[PDB]
Amino acid sequence: KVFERCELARTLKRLGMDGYRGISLANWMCLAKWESGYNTRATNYNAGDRSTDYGIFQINSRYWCNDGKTPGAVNACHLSCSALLQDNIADAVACAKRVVREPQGIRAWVAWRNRCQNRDVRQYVQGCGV
Ligand SMILES: *[C@@H]1O[C@H](CO)[C@@H](O[C@@H]2O[C@H](CO)[C@H](O)[C@H](O)[C@H]2O)[C@H](O)[C@H]1NC(C)=O
Secondary structure, eight states: OBOOHHHHHHHHHHTTOTTBTTBOHHHHHHHHHHHHTTBTTOEEEETTTTEEEETTTTEETTTTOBOSOOTTOOOTTOSBGGGGGSSOOHHHHHHHHHHTTSTTGGGGOHHHHHHTTTSOOGGGSTTSOO
16 A cells, blocks of 8 residues: 555554654654655565565564565564555554664664655655644
8 A cells, every 4th residue: 555645644643653762753754755655565675685675664574574585584573574565554663663672773774864864854744734
């Protein structure tokens, strides 16, 4: 499913993502935008290290979810990677909260670093009523 910007903003707010681990909703919005264009079905395979990023947050199969075909996977979110391809993002959100509990926090998503860090991201939630 391809969320509409504000639809996503409110869905994320409902799920307690605003200010979670000190991360604003606008920052979460900027990262989902550049990681997947708000598409829950986005999948990106890395032929180099044989791992795949799944869902709206592009979470990695080596560390967070298990897809049965990734060498050295840890499955720290304790979910099937397929759970990150549902239209309902409750699972992807619970896993994204787990990802930020790492020392690097939100730096785990380089697309956040490239497109969100040190820029004005207030436009990602403007007009959404959140
Ligand atoms: C993207 O891949 C990163 C590795 O290139 C990964 O970062 C690693 O995550 C580990 C989790 O146990 C640990 O914190 C390493 O120190 C860290 O480098 C990052 O988590 C991945 N991002 C996503 C969204 O899955």
